[PDB]
Amino acid sequence: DWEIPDGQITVGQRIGSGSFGTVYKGKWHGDVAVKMLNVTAPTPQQLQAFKNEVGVLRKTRHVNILLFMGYSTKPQLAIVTQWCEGSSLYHHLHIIETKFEMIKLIDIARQTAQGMDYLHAKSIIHRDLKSNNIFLHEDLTVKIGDFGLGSILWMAPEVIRMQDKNPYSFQSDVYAFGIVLYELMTGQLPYSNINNRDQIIFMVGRGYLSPDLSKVRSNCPKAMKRLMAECLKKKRDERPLFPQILASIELLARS
């Protein structure tokens, strides 16, 4: 059991509202992050969406995943995780424009791949891997979570198109990671020279548009570009699963 008895959680300052509920910095045995629905009465579809997020988070125990600590039913539906420190990768790369050395860019890539490999082993498709959902905790450990405060740049073509009810795959996560690798090695978002959204969508969908890999920094290894392209392949089952990605990196890493 991971219920947290009513009365123990202190909710602090508001951080933002996602699709689910609202995230606050709180205090429960130290600094913790609390995501809660701000409603009097939750509908059975929300009651369920909560149970699934909790069902998923309780299955995780890994240094590179947001540490889930517990939930609360009364007074509000609420999920407590660890309170991260620093800022997201999205922030680092495109807002404050941190200038990481390549050795760290690679190490970040590795830790991200590490968490993703773990989730996939546990049969969890993330469905929204992107730099903003990646926190650089204490500026050195990667923590994958859901931090949304929609996100098409990380979507694979088959996802874009949406032929199926469900198009999500281990492979769809891999593509997203391939875009995250783009962000790392370019320091930039993709398709920066196109100002129209629907076109970006159409084209990526139709395989007319793909990330401009020449834009990567020059000290970026040739194995790492090669890996980048493999995760970005427009055809699903040509993309490698994470065990192979993790190996590819570890190889070049020790050289």
Next chain:
Amino acid sequence: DDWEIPDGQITVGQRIGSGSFGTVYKGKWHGDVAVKMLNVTAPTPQQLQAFKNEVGVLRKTRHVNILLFMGYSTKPQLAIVTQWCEGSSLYHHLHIIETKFEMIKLIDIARQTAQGMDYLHAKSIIHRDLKSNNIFLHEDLTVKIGDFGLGSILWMAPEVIRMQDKNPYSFQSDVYAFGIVLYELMTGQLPYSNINNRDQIIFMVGRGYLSPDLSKVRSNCPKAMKRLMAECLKKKRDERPLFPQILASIELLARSLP
């Protein structure tokens, strides 16, 4: 939930420490991990039981200041997997390589150690064996309380030494061990450094003739901290404060220095 790990997944690598209880290795399971194994083939009822008790405890913990339990494995050999800490144990820092942390940092380490203990006690878990070695200073920044043993006398409270009941262990018994760690932090030494005989230490602490020497604390150790130590080291269980109160005391203390 089911935290069993499938067979042939874990790669036990270099050995890290032996001991007649079991063995700990650096390993590979979704990155770097620590792997405590039992190093016989056929485990006894007493070994199997004690294994289920350690898992039983660990899986009830989820907190930054607690060593992250990741999974267990029965086939082929019994094994427990935790996160791999990069860094050194706090004992190792203070007594082996003698790291000199600045005072604000020492207090932080105490704040976290207390933070995680508060957690455990609020989850009705008594460590029984808190000490500098069982505290890892992960990545030189976060504290991780674990149990790296395979008694440890300097941290036992008088009533624990006198073997009053079968269970002299208490939240307070743990608080006394914490007080000894604070002493390690603020002096950088183990207590009773001028005594070389173990029976005498036991006998004396048991009888109340020997208290840790608080004159030895660093000159810049605050008065409030020094008080808190003596409060934690009280010879009588009941006069020892519990961790909510401790943490609170530390946190008031903390804001009055950069």
